Amino acid sequence: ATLKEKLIAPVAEEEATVPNNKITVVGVGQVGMACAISILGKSLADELALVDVLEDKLKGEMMDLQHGSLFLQTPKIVADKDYSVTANSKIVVVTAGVRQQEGESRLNLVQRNVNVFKFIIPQIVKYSPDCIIIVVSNPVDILTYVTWKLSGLPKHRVIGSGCNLDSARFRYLMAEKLGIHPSSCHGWILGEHGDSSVAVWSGVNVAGVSLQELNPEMGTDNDSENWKEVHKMVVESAYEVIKLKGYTNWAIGLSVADLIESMLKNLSRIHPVSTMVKGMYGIENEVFLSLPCILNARGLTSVINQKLKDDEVAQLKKSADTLWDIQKDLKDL
Amino acid sequence: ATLKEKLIAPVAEEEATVPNNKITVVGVGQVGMACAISILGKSLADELALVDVLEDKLKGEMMDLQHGSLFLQTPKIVADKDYSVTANSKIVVVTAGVRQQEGESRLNLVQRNVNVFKFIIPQIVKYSPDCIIIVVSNPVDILTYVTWKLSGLPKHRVIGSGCNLDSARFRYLMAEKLGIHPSSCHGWILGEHGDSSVAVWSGVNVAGVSLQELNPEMGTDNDSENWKEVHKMVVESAYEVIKLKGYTNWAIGLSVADLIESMLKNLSRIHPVSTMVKGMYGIENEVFLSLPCILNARGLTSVINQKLKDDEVAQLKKSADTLWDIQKDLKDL
Amino acid sequence: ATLKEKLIAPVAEEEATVPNNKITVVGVGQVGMACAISILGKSLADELALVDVLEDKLKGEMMDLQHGSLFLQTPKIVADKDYSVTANSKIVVVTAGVRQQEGESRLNLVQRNVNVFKFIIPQIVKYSPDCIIIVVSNPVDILTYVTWKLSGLPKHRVIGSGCNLDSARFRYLMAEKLGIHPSSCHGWILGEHGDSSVAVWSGVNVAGVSLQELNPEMGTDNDSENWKEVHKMVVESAYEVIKLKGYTNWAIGLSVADLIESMLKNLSRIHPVSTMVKGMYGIENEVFLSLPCILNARGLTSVINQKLKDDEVAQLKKSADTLWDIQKDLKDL
Amino acid sequence: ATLKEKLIAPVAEEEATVPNNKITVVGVGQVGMACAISILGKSLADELALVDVLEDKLKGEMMDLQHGSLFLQTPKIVADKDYSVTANSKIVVVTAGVRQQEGESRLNLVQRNVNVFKFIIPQIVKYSPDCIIIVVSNPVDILTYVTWKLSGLPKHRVIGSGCNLDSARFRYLMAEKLGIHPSSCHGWILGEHGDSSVAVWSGVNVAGVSLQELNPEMGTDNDSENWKEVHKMVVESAYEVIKLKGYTNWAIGLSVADLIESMLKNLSRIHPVSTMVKGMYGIENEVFLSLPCILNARGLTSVINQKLKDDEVAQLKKSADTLWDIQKDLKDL
Ligand SMILES: NC(=O)C1=CN([C@@H]2O[C@H](COP(=O)(O)OP(=O)(O)OC[C@H]3O[C@@H](n4cnc5c(N)ncnc54)[C@H](O)[C@@H]3O)[C@@H](O)[C@H]2O)C=CC1
Ligand SMILES: NC(=O)C1=CN([C@@H]2O[C@H](COP(=O)(O)OP(=O)(O)OC[C@H]3O[C@@H](n4cnc5c(N)ncnc54)[C@H](O)[C@@H]3O)[C@@H](O)[C@H]2O)C=CC1
Ligand SMILES: NC(=O)C1=CN([C@@H]2O[C@H](COP(=O)(O)OP(=O)(O)OC[C@H]3O[C@@H](n4cnc5c(N)ncnc54)[C@H](O)[C@@H]3O)[C@@H](O)[C@H]2O)C=CC1
Ligand SMILES: NC(=O)C1=CN([C@@H]2O[C@H](COP(=O)(O)OP(=O)(O)OC[C@H]3O[C@@H](n4cnc5c(N)ncnc54)[C@H](O)[C@@H]3O)[C@@H](O)[C@H]2O)C=CC1
Ligand SMILES: c1ccc(CNCCc2c(CNC3CCCCCC3)[nH]c3ccccc23)cc1
Ligand SMILES: c1ccc(CNCCc2c(CNC3CCCCCC3)[nH]c3ccccc23)cc1
């Protein structure tokens, strides 16, 4: 009778399909939408759900993505302020809450964003008890800890985007100096995604050539080439971009899509992401900060043990102390 | 104690992989390996299993693929003569059996390849009772029927690669004449993957312009442009390529990867593939042949009802009669 | 002496890059950045230049993209307010200018954006005399005409993004009703990217089945299924999304990346884009509006002639009249 | 008058198109066709030309690829025994000649394959004087030297596929031991693509952790974990695969596509490929062997200088001496 009934003959009985690689993005602001477009561009989701408290903005973002469906391979894009829309997600990316004002530390956002997370996180696990949560909201290390405590998920299923972005920036800036692709320039930023991050100069290399072996002063204040300035540029990068355009989003969206790719393709690639590091490098408390971690379909399955220089371990311990001083006073977790 | 124990600190205490996007290719001949490399190139499997009777060849192919892992996103590639290696496959591609000699009809392979399938199909469903089977071995329409009977699987989970390849050839040949990309030149080959195929000239179009409306003689024997010769070239293509290089493999490997993409990405794209067409176009028996079908993560869920011209319906019925003449005499299914 | 001199031994004594697959995006607003991220995600440029009048915002966007380099395959990302940065671009995407307020016609933007284009287009061709220009700013059909006049380029090198986006929206909405992928649901929106667009109901098809042959009332006011409402939703879509989120950007960014892919891959795929249609369907003036066009590495090399129904031709002529009424009064082009 | 003339209205004059990223594959054997399918799969060629002395096999391979065009983004696939078909190639991949029989050294193929190259290489440069040549035929290091002498091309435009494959195998075997993706396991095989290859144990690392710092005996005969066996497995791999399936092809096809991607995308990624190493590591003659090299659109533009252990330098010099002993006895280059 209907055009659809004239055109389409069933072979199978119409039955509810459960998606196999659903992704939710919580928060459809600058970061959440950069994450969404990068996930859709890399064909990483068979279903994409969006949540926000701004109902009109949310519906607009959902419709704009839906209009691009012809160019994508994501057959279902949905959005609602209600967390029921997020059911059966494999990965939930949390970008909701407040961002830095100009010259504001990420650590100054802690009380506001803890209050946002207190109501969101229990709803995420209610509807997707088997998900991995990727925390992006700042300060990302503290809010990964908070998400672990609120969610009751195992450690391997609560990941902070952490220093995957800082390390991308570091590798870009070193690769630009050397005239090579960042993928061929190896270097790790660890610890806090923020001012106390640690540059592991001792592991920086190109084709397995230690650059600190070529320039032993690399990373010190007594270096005629002032490589230390590259780590200062990594630390200052968010502040500089926020002064120019108000926020950052494109690089973090690609960084989050890189983490999702490793997990949904089950690759066991190593990324510097935020995890619980008690018992590593003499850290005595449940600090979350970035170390090199193996990521696959289970989540964050292992941490790489490193031989660090004394000044590197000292900076990592200082970063841990900086974060623990905030974590220890958090209430009702 | 081991280097691995020194380097890698567990976060998850468990290392077992849950079966997920596993594909098996049965047969490691020219077609099975083209299927395998196209599945790996398009990142369509997290686990690829190869099964075949030829143990040395199978191990060599497995090792050669494993050596390219750095360039791929498939973390597990395995191979064995025993079907236990195929356990918990979501899709199984069947390419094993005899192939055409020069000038040989695909229909002449039926007794030999039915005997191969009486062995193989029960082993597939023993180890993957919840799989989708894509049949590629020839004659593909008859062997799709045979696989359906032997497997006990529902219709929507047994698919013959069918005329997805014939249609690709048809679109290439018409697009070459018009100077456009085959993706912009729409045309359907239906029925037997073989000599009795149907060119649906009444549906051939560019930008929704019916080419038969522009040239009503298109596909008739009274056409000065002789468009009918294009269908003759589609029918003869396998024989011409077999005469020149001995077999065909690259285009069918890409065609199979196209079908898998629609299913694993859950897209509900329409392909001309082999399904059970009883009750369509006056067909009274359980004939399998190619019609436009919707493919998604459930398998083959719908068929498109078409308005055909009399000469199109007549060739489709002739195709069904040709195939049923062989099907009706099959024993012990 | 330097770490770079210690590490890197020249084989080639020269480092300059020969200009090749360079793309400029003019405008770093919502649309320019969606275009930029989609071009980078699809690896469509070896060099991306951003040009804009807002120097701080431009530098911030350039830095944010640069920080994602590790995740991309574009080795050079540059930005300046001076058009010297755009030199030797193969493709220039123009997204600069004013956009619609809530409820505002795209045609109300004409005087403002003609003033923008009178500055921008001469600067583009000064620095890239051999480029293809893709016009995105609204009203896109009028500004494609203005760009043709100001640039002195041949017709095949000046393209309006046009109805590629309207057609994607149309195919999304029809595919959603039928439960299929938009890539399997064929349908064309022609004429103005705006209120006077034409839905070619006579060409709408699935697997070469004309849907108007199944439902002759499709696209008329006397249709119990009211398929006409789908064309109304296409026309209203920009206004609805602007009401909800303030602007549109994701779908047009993907649409522009689709056009660039056809051209840089030299594919001769057909897209409904804005071109000079004098002499077509009795149009007597140099009107620009969308028809199905072949796109390849030369640009826009052909238009598809269509057999249209009387109501489709009537709307196309009305669309042409609507645009010519504005074009005829333009001065100093 | 013709259907094409009714359907397609010219905007531009029909003009001969010069491809911008044409690739030729010389030899359509097991390696040449693995190269071709990997190039087509990664969308690296707007035109693909095939050359072989076997005219029928060549035409059949061309047709089988053409039949897959709908699934590809390569609008022109051509093939001929005449090198005029290769004109205006950016990259020419040479796979032609004889391969190893079972247990045969690659070095034993040198006189036969030099005789093939003496005829081929002058014709390649005649028709594509601006190309990069990637040598794959064995013994690859000596034939890269021979191709340099015969071609008269600059060093940076003559590249041997070299140890890109050996290093992929090495990284796969180490990554399998550690349970990580090969892309996260860093290790270099240098020198001859063959029995005298050098494992740079001192540069092997995961996340910038030197594995030889964890196990100082790594690569010695006095190692309880016998990591040296992994290098033996790399050396023996081609022989083992040749014993099982007769040849190798899939891994080298993906390795060649990786080198092409770096060059056509202008990335300046580092690969261990065969280049002229006179003046490096006390090598006094025009030896070609693999070192880490930067690859971009210019070709092989730099070599990475490494700090190697004494035993590693000794092995590299022994590899150079092994290759020079063959190069010095070659006639009429
Ligand atoms: N980890 C990293 O590397 C980076 C983190 N960030 C962080 O990402 C977060 C988001 O930044 P933007 O997207 O630029 O901010 P934004 O202001 O553009 O968007 C934030 C969104 O969160 C929504 N939201 C607020 N409260 C909510 C609640 N209770 N439930 C649901 N949605 C809620 C808002 O309505 C808004 O749409 C910030 O915390 C920022 O500091 C930003 C850049 C990089
Ligand atoms: N549906 C389509 O469009 C196409 C179908 N084909 C069909 O694909 C099949 C495979 O072709 P190729 O790979 O070229 O053949 P091939 O000879 O290269 O490989 C045949 C494979 O099946 C195995 N096999 C052969 N005889 C067997 C037996 N008696 N029992 C168990 N395993 C056996 C072999 O060990 C080998 O792995 C043929 O039936 C051929 O007609 C070929 C091309 C296109
Ligand atoms: N063709 C299509 O399908 C679509 C077209 N558009 C059009 O794209 C254009 C850009 O929209 P958005 O990016 O959302 O706007 P936006 O306000 O976010 O960005 C506009 C950009 O143009 C620059 N610009 C503004 N006024 C200028 C002037 N007087 N001179 C020079 N540069 C100037 C701004 O600095 C900024 O870079 C608008 O004309 C809009 O109507 C919007 C969406 C889809
Ligand atoms: N560098 C590497 O890592 C690897 C190198 N190889 C080498 O690749 C080469 C090709 O191996 P396969 O493809 O397996 O051999 P194959 O025997 O399958 O194909 C070689 C092709 O070269 C053609 N040919 C012979 N002389 C020719 C000439 N004068 N002009 C044009 N074409 C000519 C033959 O007709 C044949 O089609 C061998 O030298 C082999 O050792 C193989 C694997 C990996
Ligand atoms: C002679 C001696 C040593 C070599 C090979 N050098 C490999 C050494 C190496 C380092 C340096 N590790 C530092 C060393 C100081 C102790 C504290 C921190 C760890 N980083 C890498 C990153 C990647 C690869 C290797 C390395 C060659 C010749
Ligand atoms: C019997 C008669 C005819 C057929 C199949 N006919 C397919 C025809 C067709 C149309 C309809 N064209 C219109 C109709 C006339 C009004 C003026 C404009 C042109 N659109 C398509 C889009 C795609 C493919 C085909 C078509 C089958 C059986």
Q: Could you describe the 3D structure shown?
A:
Four copies of one chain form a homotetramer. In chain A, strand 10 and strand 11 form a beta hairpin. In chain A, helix 4 packs across helix 5 (about 140-150) and helix 6 (about 165-180) crosses helix 8. The longest helix of chain A has 18 residues, at about 110-125. Chain A folds into two domains: about 5 and about 10-165, NAD(P)-binding Rossmann-like Domain (Rossmann fold, 3-Layer(aba) Sandwich); about 165-330, Lactate dehydrogenase/glycoside hydrolase, family 4, C-terminal (L-2-Hydroxyisocaproate Dehydrogenase, Chain A, domain 2, Alpha-Beta Complex), CATH 3.90.110.10. Chain A is globular. Chain A has about 325 residues and is of the alpha/beta class. In chain A, the strands form four sheets. A six-stranded parallel beta sheet of chain A has the order 4-3-2-5-6-7, sandwiched between helices. Chain A has a three-stranded antiparallel beta sheet with strand order 12-13-14. The first copy, chain A, has a two-stranded antiparallel sheet with strand order 8-9. Chain A is built from ten helices and 14 strands. At the A-C interface, helix 1, helix 2, helix 3, helix 6 and helix 8 of A face helix 1, helix 2, helix 3, helix 6 and helix 8 of C. Strand 1 (about 10) of chain C pairs antiparallel with strand 14 (about 300-305) of chain D. One copy of the ligand c1ccc(CNCCc2c(CNC3CCCCCC3)[nH]c3ccccc23)cc1 sits at the interface of chains A and D.
